[PDB]
Amino acid sequence: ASLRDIKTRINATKKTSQITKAMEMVSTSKLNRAEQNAKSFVPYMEKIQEVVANVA
Amino acid sequence: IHVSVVTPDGPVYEDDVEMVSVKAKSGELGILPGHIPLVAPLEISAARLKKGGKTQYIAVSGGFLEVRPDKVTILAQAAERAEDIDVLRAKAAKERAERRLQSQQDDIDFKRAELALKRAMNRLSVAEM
Amino acid sequence: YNHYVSAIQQEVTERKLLPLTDLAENKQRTVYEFEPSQEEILDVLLPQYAESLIYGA
């Protein structure tokens, strides 16, 4: 092929790699927050389950 | 002895008041230590706590009452310490728009990154080589 | 829905919600003083349970 074409291809794939890395970091942070958001729900469920099991 | 209020969104309030009264469906009840276990639903009203030196109030919506000689637990879907139903409705109306705009912001934030990725990817195909 | 097992593994699960024919009892159980009626309590009790299940999923 051509030297300039190879250089441009390398630059383009580097740019795509950088964008994908940024997206990965954002997704990791969102998952980290979502874990605590999910964890904050236990006591209500663990009480209503016991009440229903006792009553029904 | 102590009373606790829980919500699917997390804990709300806790104290060691030893005398609580609430307006249950088809009647009214007063709770003192050593009570027999009982189960009863609750109406839309404000629960009052008395045996804490001074009176204290808290509002619940769609609640459920669970009483034990050791602990008192109230299951509610919404709670507020302002004792007023109208302020609770106003709070819900205020939070509606906030969550709507948060969702819109999240959508546009994702869309901008998607457009940037598409533009970055197009150049590789442009550079046929 | 998908169940979160690990950061690298996710599995598809199928769950029956109602008529809730299968249920598990607690290890410790105590009788309750129904008020005003045991039949009247369940009508209000059950939908909250179903909604909590949906929220967790």
CATH code of the domain covering residue B19: 2.60.15.10
Ranges assigned E (strand) in B1-129: 3-7, 10-15, 20-22, 29-31, 38-41, 46-49, 56-61, 64-67, 72-75, 78-80
Q: Residues of B at the A interface (Cβ-Cβ below 8 Å)?
A: 6-11, 39, 64, 66, 73, 75, 113, 116-117, 120-121, 123-124, 127-129
Tell me which chain C residue has its CA closest to the CA of residue B39. Answer: C34
Residues of C in contact with B40 (CB under 8 A): 35-36, 41
Residue of A nearest to B128 (CA): A5
Alpha helices in A1-56 (DSSP H): 3-39, 42-55
Q: Is B70 annotated as a binding residue?
A: no
The 10 Å Cβ neighbour count of residue B75 is 22
Are the CB atoms for B12 and B6 separated by under 8 Å? Answer: yes
Helix (H/G/I), strand (E/B), else coil: B99: helix
Contact C3, C13 (CB under 8 A): yes
Question: Domain containing B40: what range?
Answer: 3-85
The Cα B60–Cα B85 span in angstroms is 9
- Please tell me the distance from the alpha carbon of residue A12 to that of residue B127, in angstroms, as a whole number: 9
B112 is in an annotated binding site: yes
Q: Could you tell me which chain A residue has the CA closest to the CA of C30?
A: A54
Cβ neighbour number for residue B107 with a 10 Å cutoff: 10
CB-CB contact of B98 with B66 (8 Å): no
**Closest listed residue to residue B61, CA positions, set B87, B97, B33:** B87
Contacts of A8 in chain B (CB under 8 A): 123, 127
User: Scanning the structure block, which residue is given the tokens 């441009």?
Assistant: A8
The answer to whether the Cβ–Cβ distance between B75 and A15 falls below 8 Å is: no
Identify whether the C-beta of residue B26 lies closer than 8 Å to the C-beta of residue C36.
Answer: yes
A54–C32 C-beta distance less than 8 A: yes
Chain C neighbours (≥3 Cβ pairs under 8 A) are A, B
